[PDB]
Amino acid sequence: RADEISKIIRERIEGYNREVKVVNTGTVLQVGDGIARIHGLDEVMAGELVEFEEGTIGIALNLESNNVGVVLMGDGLMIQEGSSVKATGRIAQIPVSEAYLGRVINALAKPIDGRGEITASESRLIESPAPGIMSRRSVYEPLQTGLIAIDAMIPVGRGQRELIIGDRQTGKTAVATDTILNQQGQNVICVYVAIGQKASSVAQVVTNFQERGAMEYTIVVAETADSPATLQYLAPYTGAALAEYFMYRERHTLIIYDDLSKQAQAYRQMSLLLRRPPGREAYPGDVFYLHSRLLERAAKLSSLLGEGSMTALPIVETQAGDVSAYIPTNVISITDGQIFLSADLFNAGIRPAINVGISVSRVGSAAQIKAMKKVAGKLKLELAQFAELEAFAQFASDLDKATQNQLARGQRLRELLKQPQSAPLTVEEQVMTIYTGTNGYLDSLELDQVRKYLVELRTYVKTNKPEFQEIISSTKTFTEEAEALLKEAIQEQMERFLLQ
Amino acid sequence: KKNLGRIAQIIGPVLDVAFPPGKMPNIYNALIVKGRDTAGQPMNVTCEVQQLLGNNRVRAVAMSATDGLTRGMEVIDTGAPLSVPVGGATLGRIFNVLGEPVDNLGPVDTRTTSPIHRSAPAFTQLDTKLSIFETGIKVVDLLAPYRRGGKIGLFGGAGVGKTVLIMELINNIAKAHGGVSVFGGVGERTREGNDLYMEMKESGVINEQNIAESKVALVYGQMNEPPGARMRVGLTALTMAEYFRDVNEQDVLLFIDNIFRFVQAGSEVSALLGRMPSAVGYQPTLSTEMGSLQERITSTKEGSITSIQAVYVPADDLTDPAPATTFAHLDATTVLSRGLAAKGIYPAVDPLDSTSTMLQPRIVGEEHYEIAQRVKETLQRYKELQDIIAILGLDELSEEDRLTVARARKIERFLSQPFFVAEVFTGSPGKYVGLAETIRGFQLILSGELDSLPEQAFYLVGNIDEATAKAMNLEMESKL
């Protein structure tokens, strides 16, 4: 501890060779509200990092004829109005490596958890171009979210951009966390980008991750609501850069942009402060470009680039149910599918509050395994018929027996779509659940018993008949032998449950 | 000091001061304008530098009024970000946006000051302790259990509550609290400020016999104050609470009046600060201006700040930008419905809108969680049955929906409760209802054994024994 400081001083004095280079420099004219108009940076390029006399670092965004409008990644309190702004020549990279797994970082790829510092050797530009047409494939691998109503009705594949759009406090963050926890068995690197959130919310989310063990394969990019607008606007792009590193190294990744609406509002704030012409809801005309340039990075690579992929799960919050709002329409146009959450469904008890009648997935059944499509067909047909007859539920007594049967079937298929928070189901468990419900081996129980019977049944199968799990896992198809094992387990569990 | 400037322009609250070529203030410094009083006498006006204008000019929003202020007045750059007295010298005294006493007592000890601006606590120094403190109100004990050490929010227009609610919470908790309390009245009325001050002197909180034995520090900038003072009174009170959380390491109880006023004061000055208008008329920096102050409010793992904030929802537009950007910062929101105030379900708390993060089974207990879920489902089913009732007839309804409607009307009546601070409005004495009695009462109601009491037997009663007593009294009035 005595000579190490001296040898570090010696190595750091022998490292540099006193090199000289022409720097592009300028002087601050006016600074205020996170923007600086600086005079002199003539060779500066659009999107380049400039460094201020007081240590603040900013981006040269709009290059006008008289000055350079610069957004500050910090507080411009100490900027002097005459201080020297020296351009760095670089465009906004981050150091990237595998040592980020388990870490919490801000939009500068620097740790905010105080667990040390990431050793990173490679580097990647924050704004990197998306994969082209010829460096892509068709999305065919499923991305299991653990939510049965998602994986059966709105299936997500690896390389697909699915929108988690809903009202406030309907369960968007919950769906995102259940998917990150369900990625436990799979080798999917997960990325959660917290944009403009409260710091205690990010604290709870990351401690929940560490508890359930989903922190060994996850990275958390956090830009809370006290951050400058520039950092909350840059954070999803650093998340995308990290996931792109892992994607091009033949790994499958998952990225959740929680409240991309906050990124749109931050970008609108800095656009308005740079005095740019606004549009609808004062959003700049390139806010669609902001969102699309980010979402097109989520690709499924081309089997000569490595078969890797990056699934993107952006989260968009609607206000007063206005799906026709500006940013929701933008992201709905950009993304592959949409997953709508309803506050009426959330209040009525059905959680997660997925509105399947209005949720789409343009990828379709190609994002499913072969064992899931068989049972998902019947689930889809029966839930559709229930949605038809739902207005007739108050007149059920004076109706045909087939109509009463379809009404009861739908109203107890709705009970198995309910699911507690942070409890994602494995694909075999949800396949067996859909099979039982859709065939009608629970058309005898009471609705206050369907969920409990199904929990006991899933535990019973997973413990007593592991051959069903093995058949559905290895062959990925709903084999007749699996059907036999499942019918035997259903009979035996019905007897054990009627034993009370 | 050495940095003496001159007023260049006066436009309402915004004034830009011309300073020497090299020497200039920083953003968020305090400038002191040597003004003249109404009579012939020197007056002081404090300003706050907002932006550097480029020609040795800096825009500053004034804390006081600028009527009577000439161009070319000397301006003293204090070189500080507008410090504020903190510590025990503040407990029991009404303060100002500038930290000066306005309770017509002696001066305050400037020995321990703190600047009005600050950065939020780091991410490593945050709590993850998920607790619940009991308030005594049925509708928030059973539906949106407020978190101990968290940020609570009160939404609603003008005339639904949030002020009677915040006074009821003050009544119920500010003396049962161990640490100090801090009230910040941002852009609210002066009559309500004087009433709260008299009631705190009465309740033995101010302890007027000796002030330093008190546990509250009132900071106040009302509607009559300029937009620059309503914009910084929140940071003043927040700094006073930061000191009690950090240096004294005691649990602080921070009550805020309308934080909508903190945002609309910024939106008022923002046009004069040259900033271009954002969505419907707020400043382009609404989200960051909210976020700085909100993230500064935090339980920092060495002390906790429980923050109860009233958020004015303008024109009952719950999707207005100002409340929309607050929802994301609060922990347990509590929406107030004008539809319940219109019939007298005070506290007119919207049961299906008021959510909370403590209403989780592992935090709250399975009995509490399940009874809250059942109440919410019954109210939602009744709200969805509303139009099949309101036109097609309540008589033709099925057997299960008639029981749903009856039990939901009984639940709606039972959510109301008479407050101790609102016996001037309800004309009846107030009642404190513990959590267990709330759980037991709602479990009785939706059990089906209280199906015999009239609906009005559940109106404005404390607990379920009061409901049964009122039912008995109603039956007696109906018979003889």
């Binding site: 007063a320 149910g321 206005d322 | 024109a315 009952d316 537009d317 719950l318 999707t319």
Partner: peptide, 11 residues
């Protein structure tokens, strides 16, 4: 809140 109450009336 006028558009939302219109949407709810339509619903």
């Amino acid at each position: 809140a006028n558009l939302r109450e219109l949407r709810d009336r339509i619903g």
